[PDB]
Design a protein around this ligand. Sequence first.
Ligand SMILES: Cc1cc2nc3c(=O)[nH]c(=O)nc-3n(C[C@H](O)[C@H](OP(=O)(O)O)[C@H](O)CO)c2cc1C
Ligand SMILES: Cc1cc2nc3c(=O)[nH]c(=O)nc-3n(C[C@H](O)[C@H](OP(=O)(O)O)[C@H](O)CO)c2cc1C
Ligand SMILES: Cc1cc2nc3c(=O)[nH]c(=O)nc-3n(C[C@H](O)[C@H](O)[C@H](O)CO)c2cc1C
Ligand SMILES: Cc1cc2nc3c(=O)[nH]c(=O)nc-3n(C[C@H](O)[C@H](O)[C@H](O)CO)c2cc1C
Lengths: 447, 446
Amino acid sequence: KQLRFGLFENAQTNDSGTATWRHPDNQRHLFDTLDYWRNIAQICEDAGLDFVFLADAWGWADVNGERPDICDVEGLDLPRLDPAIVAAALIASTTKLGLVMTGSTLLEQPYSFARRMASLDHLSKGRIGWNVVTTGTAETASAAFGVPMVAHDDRYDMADDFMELVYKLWEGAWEPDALERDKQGRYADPAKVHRIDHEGPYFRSNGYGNTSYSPQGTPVLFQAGSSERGRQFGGRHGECIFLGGAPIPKLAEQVRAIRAEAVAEGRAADSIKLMAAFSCVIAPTHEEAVQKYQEVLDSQTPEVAVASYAWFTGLDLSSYDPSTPMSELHTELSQTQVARFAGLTVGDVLADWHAHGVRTKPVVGTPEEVADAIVELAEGADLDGFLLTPVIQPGSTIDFIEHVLPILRERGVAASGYDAPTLRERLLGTETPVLREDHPGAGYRAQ
Amino acid sequence: KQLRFGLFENAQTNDSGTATWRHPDNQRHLFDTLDYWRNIAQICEDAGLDFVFLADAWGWADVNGERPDICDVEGLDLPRLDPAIVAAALIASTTKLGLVMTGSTLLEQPYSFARRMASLDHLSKGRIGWNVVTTGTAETASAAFGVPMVAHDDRYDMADDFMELVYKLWEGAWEPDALERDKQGRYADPAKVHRIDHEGPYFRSNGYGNTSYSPQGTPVLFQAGSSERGRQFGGRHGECIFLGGAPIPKLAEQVRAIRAEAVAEGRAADSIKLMAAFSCVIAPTHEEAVQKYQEVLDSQTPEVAVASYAWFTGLDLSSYDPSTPMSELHTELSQTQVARFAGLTVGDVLADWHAHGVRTKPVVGTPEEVADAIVELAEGADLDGFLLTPVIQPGSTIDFIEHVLPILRERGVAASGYDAPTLRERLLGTETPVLREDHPGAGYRA
Ligand SMILES: Cc1cc2nc3c(=O)[nH]c(=O)nc-3n(C[C@H](O)[C@H](OP(=O)(O)O)[C@H](O)CO)c2cc1C
Ligand SMILES: Cc1cc2nc3c(=O)[nH]c(=O)nc-3n(C[C@H](O)[C@H](OP(=O)(O)O)[C@H](O)CO)c2cc1C
Ligand SMILES: Cc1cc2nc3c(=O)[nH]c(=O)nc-3n(C[C@H](O)[C@H](O)[C@H](O)CO)c2cc1C
Ligand SMILES: Cc1cc2nc3c(=O)[nH]c(=O)nc-3n(C[C@H](O)[C@H](O)[C@H](O)CO)c2cc1C
């Protein structure tokens, strides 16, 4: 079984509720420069990584109504760039690397979003993916857009409606062979260009779509959101499911449950790909790697913890008795960030939240030790790939590529290069760039 | 006086309601490939053109209630790409060229639009502009987005509110020096990062902005829309006003009116820039140029006229007797495409609409003839610049660059190369990349 590998990034200085930016070798304070992204993309493409993945957020770290000063002192949450713009710039600098961007069904307008993603897919020749999210910063983000807040599960219902409309725009509006471009004949076959009609609980659309059928039709659908309602949503729509890290027995059960959701939705159990976040700290000896990790931790101040947690949950941990069990608390925002701490207390969470944030504890050791841990995770949890989540950039990515990936390639668990030209062919193993017939999006094709 | 020059383009096969795509040398059927745009951008940047301009449209040519099949046979209105994506891809392939993209105040969300434009400005190091439109295809576009239609003058009221909000996001949310990025100090100064508050008739926003202060702060504000209400809007907000072609005395009156609008808003009269569309066919002799233009007209079927005109006005010209004068027709869409023919009749412009659409006839002649026409227009109408509107691509652009631009440079009416690194410095002559202190957007700074 050949695993897929992508790089997790985001267009801001820090990520995932941590703040490693002060580490001497970290360079992502340059995230607002194109040279930073050109460098990252060239590193990944030269190595043959399947894709670079851009996370996104729309809101900010509001604590009990205001944003504490530490958020600016540490660049915790803001400022950021728009992922679609970063992705479009990286198209021009790459030829084979996949580009996956996070996009919110809560805050995008589906008609404009459909045109934007199809434009990226046209210009990149089918290298685009979309990580479907319902936005974990939903409360502040709604305020910034001037619209009422939408509850957690309703955002997944709204996302269902969002998907049906973009499926119509991407798959039903223009048939794949509509464009003929024959100067002696027809530019397009009118019989293959259709008005679409959509009247859902959240979205309405009537008319033609702006973009013609793109190389992949629909961008590769990533999905990140491992709440119960999110797992149902990913089991229905997601082609590649991004999972946070966890002990192998817990990760195996999550993978099993998500494959069973896909089966209950009429999809083949193997037609959905499960990819785990994976962070690592690599050094020539195990003791050196442990020390390297200590230096990363030493750069992070604990004072970010409360605002960081409030950024994703709206919960102010500093206002409860630290013995309060997390099982008693609820959020309409990032529900996995509460549910993952069931059994623990508020004081437990607040004790080392700053160290990992929403992220996973790293695997720390020699290159062989880290490669062994990747294989153990993939076999033990039935995973299809990994998104490398760096602790500092570009060092964490360079270290993995230079020292761990070659062992994985020699063991035959990582491919040596770019076999297929589109992201879907590469990730899903199809020999067609378009959605499988047992995917919901296929049902909206002109038949 | 040094004139500025940009290239008008759009991310679709044809433009402006005409359809020249069948000409053997036309390449814009490749608009959905990045290589097409790389070539255009390289041609413009090698020549030192100030910018490439991307128009936009959201709607389509609805005649009565649907799209005649001639729209697909001729690729008249669809398909197209998103201009921001094209612009971002061209950022990476260029270093000094300006990139101006059309964006709709009717259908964009200001908060996400502000983040998008500022991201383009950061990544391009201050080379981005925004052409503010209220969408001339508003009826179909509104149905596509599932939103109720907004009447013509109300769309400019909505644009006013849109502008105030994005000014707050671009100028007032993060002070220009907020970021320090000092690993032994602070990442940012909390006293220079501000919560903004906005409550308007059309938009609302409360909270922080996503993007820090970008190199120009606000993209260079182009504005296109020459109705009376649009001239008032441009006079307040626009830094570079895009005007359609017209006879010199009519263009001159428009320039005069728009500068008076700017003065009324507390701006200096010279500080708003007026740039006219200009199309031309160039050849070594006049007779060669006439024949070269005729070979273009030969590829344009008149059958698109009804759909093309309906695309911009919602009006079906074949549904009137030709004797009906245009002065009796009215639209809530592209009102200038109705007002420009006041005094003619339906049958008059139905007969020639396919030739030029929303544009005007090209100047056809030798390089010396075309350069003379450029100078006579700029002097007579008090213009600051031109946007070349090609007839075919890349041929019309190359011809202008290789044969007319050298004359203009030798005469001293065009600069020889790139003088300044940001688009606002190059077009407005400011001392720094940010808005003039007498522009309304500067009032929203902290
Ligand atoms: C690995 C990974 C990455 C994620 N990245 C993002 C992101 O970049 N932006 C986002 O809004 N939501 C992301 N999420 C989703 C949140 O956890 C959350 O889902 P859920 O846990 O509530 O189902 C939604 O934002 C809630 O609206 C991610 C989830 C996972 C598992
Ligand atoms: C030279 C040039 C170019 C224009 N380009 C566009 C465009 O690309 N997209 C657009 O929606 N509206 C463009 N317009 C504006 C339309 O004429 C029209 O303005 P107005 O004439 O009614 O004031 C608005 O679309 C109405 O909503 C342009 C106007 C001019 C003068
Ligand atoms: C393992 C992992 C888990 C994540 N969980 C969340 C989450 O629960 N909510 C959220 O908004 N973002 C989540 N993210 C996205 C992350 O916080 C990202 O840096 C921000 O969204 C800024 O782009 C997660 C990212 C990773 C790598
Ligand atoms: C001189 C000139 C005038 C234009 N007038 C309009 C207009 O009135 N309405 C409109 O929607 N677009 C107008 N455009 C934009 C043009 O139709 C563009 O090709 C389409 O919007 C597709 O991007 C104009 C463009 C030029 C160069």
